[PDB]
Amino acid sequence: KETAAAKFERQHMDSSTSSSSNYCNQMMKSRNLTKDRCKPVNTFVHESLADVQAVCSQKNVACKNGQTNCYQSYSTMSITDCRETGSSKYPNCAYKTTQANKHIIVACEGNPYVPVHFDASV
């Protein structure tokens, strides 16, 4: 069985990189996000696990749903936004790769306190 922390890593972590217009389509599948349906939008953080995990001890901010356990990062991080195009229909999911440098906001919980949800990027 997969955990909240392990799922976040699976869905939003890609430290191996730091790309091409192929990225999203290739990543969204190899991460099993297009399994039972094409996920409308996702985000991959090209930073180290430690860097992302340290956000849980950074700027405490309100989550988009009202909860109080969200944290925003002091520094901007290298990320990638994947948006589902118009020429996209399951099982053939098409995503628009878009790189950027923005602060990230995540939901943290547990013992140890680690990110279990990616809330937004500002």
31, 46, 103, 117: the active-site residue:
117
Residues 90, 99: Cα–Cα separation, whole Å = 24
- CA-CA distance, 99 to 62, in Å (whole number)? 25
7 among the known binding-site residues?
yes
Question: Binding site annotation covers 83?
Answer: yes
Choose the catalytic residue: 8, 9, 11, 12.
12
Find out whether the peptide bond into 40 is cis, omega within 30 degrees of 0. no
Q: Is 97 annotated as a binding residue?
A: no
Would you say 37 is a known binding-site residue? no
Q: Is 103 a catalytic residue?
A: no
42 assigned to a ligand binding site: yes
Q: Is 116 annotated as a binding residue?
A: no
101 is in an annotated binding site: no
- Classify the phi-psi angles of 89: left when phi > 0, otherwise alpha if psi is within -120 to 50, otherwise beta: beta
Backbone phi, then psi, for 117, in 5-degree steps?
-160, 140
**Quick check: is 12 catalytic?**
yes
How far is it, in rounded angstroms, from Cα 37 to Cα 103? Answer: 29
Return binding residues for substrate: 7, 10, 39-43, 64, 83
The annotation places the binding site at 7, 10, 39-43, 64, 83
Catalytic residues: 12, 117
